[PDB]
Design a protein around this ligand. Structure first.
Ligand SMILES: [Zn+2]
Lengths: 319, 206, 99
């Protein structure tokens, strides 16, 4: 019996997701537990039919819904889906930003191993990426400049979401001609945000419009995963759902100033008995934790499930 | 706004009302021996690479313009119809650089280019060492559409956007009209394969 | 005359699907038939996915359409196909002999 699935199953039972208005016109996709193949081409017409499916049919380790609207969402033939517009998306990754500590070890012996398998025990090696709150602070600067560009240069009304793991998401819900932009008409918007073709305006005022005033305020380009903006058919992670590599809520950020990276992002309460793999002095969810290999520790469920999904150990019991 | 310089102001079925009524363009071309020669004079000057003369040099500038579009719709050469739209719109670029700001907007409205005036935005540049002034605004969605087949200089990055509107100056407003004239001429020839012209008039332009 | 080019686009190919688009198909739809620059993007993409054993991206297709529009290139003749790429001639004739 998988203990993590029960935590996820218990959440989606009572949790209310942030689903769009045109719910019946979007393709749903998820990643089940214990597998890597994606189950897509799903169509749901209400939040009660989706709640029925996640709890009783296929529990999602990751849960997405398509950014594009389709008149026939559950069709495999591409042109049979009848594409009728898609939202504008922006993803800010921490890959380029902070570059974090990362160890690779064997879950049995505990020694640091670079190869795919440990030569002693013949097991798959695991990797742990230390997500620090300082990285979230750096990434939070980019979403502030990105929202500034989308509001002062395009007149758009974007929403900010926490990605559930490493970065943030910026989504602009559009229904008119903004949703019919081509893949190349979205790349001119992406490279405008990144400051690719933007020339250096070396002697402009700080009150100048566009990039002239922004280049002189000390702000350069915005670091985004430009592949998300180019794609006209993307899978948006459903807000208020759970991430598969942390177990945190995809929470909408109404104000970027009072966003804290702590245990409040995880909905799980109670305590768990956590059996670590490695002795490490790492920062987890805003605080430093010292784990000892093979010595069980009683920590909160919010911090226990987080370490389990980052391959740092195992959750053995719930108390 | 001179009609002798810009023949696309008067429609084809509007210039013909001078001749009473019912006299279509096919009636004049069958009787006129020189209207077809003035059209072939422009077609054979695009193939060689030379310029195209201004429409102020003809006696019937509106008729010469439409008989040239009709003669290209009979030749059916797509590589030639395309080559004409560049040399034709290039001929208007020189006539546009000597036009006041009021007549430039009067043409962009007839081309359905959503471009209006606004409060002038002034800013300084180091590379140009001048004082740049933008006084024409276009929505960025329409801007990405107009600059669909243009160079890299028209990219959204090298522009000044504010609240979703790209700010243009005088030489950029002319740059979008020249691209629009090239586009309309391509559109204005596709549905010209309809009217079955008398087969003798087809052999005259061939 | 360019009657055989529409026949191959209506059926499909197998081996040389990219070489038929670069030197023949894309030049005919843009510089002979005169369809929209984006209309030819769907006409060429539906041609590549007939045997479906392969994937073409919209990046390489737009690069060929915008390339022949500037260079003004015209599609190759069947006699020129026999001179250059003889493997593509047999691939086309097998489709032509199917009617
Ligand atoms: Zn080991």
């Amino acid at each position: 019996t998988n203990l993590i699935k029960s935590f996820f199953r218990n959440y989606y039972l009572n949790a209310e997701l942030e689903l769009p208005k045109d719910m019946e016109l979007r393709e749903f996709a998820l990643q089940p537990f214990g597998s890597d193949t994606y189950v897509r081409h799903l169509s749901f017409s209400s939040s009660e039919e989706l709640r029925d499916y996640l709890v009783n049919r296929n529990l999602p380790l990751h849960l997405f819904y398509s950014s594009a609207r389709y008149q026939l969402p559950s069709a495999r033939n591409m042109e049979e889906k009848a594409w009728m517009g898609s939202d504008l998306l922006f993803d800010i990754d921490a890959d380029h930003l902070c570059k974090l500590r990362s160890i690779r070890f064997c879950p049995v012996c505990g020694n640091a191993v670079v190869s795919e398998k440990c030569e002693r025990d013949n097991v798959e090696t695991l990797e742990y990426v230390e997500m620090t709150s300082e990285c979230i602070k750096r990434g939070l600067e980019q979403t502030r400049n990105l929202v500034e560009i989308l509001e002062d240069d395009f007149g758009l009304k974007p929403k900010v979401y926490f990605s559930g793991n490493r970065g943030f998401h910026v989504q602009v819900d559009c229904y008119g001609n903004c949703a019919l932009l081509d893949s190349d008409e979205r790349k001119e918007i992406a490279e405008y945000v990144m400051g690719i073709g933007v020339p250096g305006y070396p002697g402009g005022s700080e009150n100048a419009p566009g990039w002239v005033g922004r280049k002189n305020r000390g702000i350069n380009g915005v670091t985004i995963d430009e592949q998300v903006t180019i794609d006209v058919k993307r899978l948006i992670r459903i807000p208020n759902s759970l991430h598969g590599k942390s177990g945190l809520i995809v929470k909408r950020v109404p104000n970027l100033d009072d966003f804290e990276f702590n245990e409040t992002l995880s909905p799980f309460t109670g305590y768990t008995i956590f059996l670590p793999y490695i002795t490490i002095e790492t920062e987890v969810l805003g605080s430093i934790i010292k784990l000892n290999r093979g010595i069980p520790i009683k920590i909160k469920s919010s911090i226990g499930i987080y370490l389990h999904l980052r391959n740092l150990g195992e959750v053995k019991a719930y108390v | 706004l001179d009609v002798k310089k810009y023949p696309f102001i008067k429609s084809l079925d509007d210039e013909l009302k001078k001749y009473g009524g019912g006299i279509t363009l096919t009636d004049l071309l069958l009787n006129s021996t020189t209207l077809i020669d003035q059209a072939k004079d422009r077609i054979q000057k695009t193939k060689s690479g030379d310029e195209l003369p201004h429409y102020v040099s003809y006696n019937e500038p509106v008729l010469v313009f439409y008989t040239t579009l009709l003669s290209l719709a009979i030749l059916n050469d797509v590589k030639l119809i395309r080559r004409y739209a560049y040399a034709e719109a290039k001929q208007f670029r020189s006539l546009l650089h000597t036009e006041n700001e009021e007549n430039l907007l009067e043409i962009s409205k007839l081309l359905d280019l959503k471009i209006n005036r606004c409060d002038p935005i002034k800013f300084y540049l180091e590379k140009k060492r001048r004082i740049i002034q933008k006084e024409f605004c276009v929505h960025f969605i329409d801007y990405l559409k107009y600059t669909k087949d243009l160079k890299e200089d028209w990219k959204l990055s090298g522009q000044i956007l504010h609240k979703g509107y790209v700010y243009l100056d005088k030489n950029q407003l002319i740059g979008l009209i020249a691209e629009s004239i090239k586009s309309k001429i391509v559109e204005m020839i596709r549905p010209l394969n309809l009217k079955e012209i008398p087969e003798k008039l087809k052999s005259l332009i061939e």
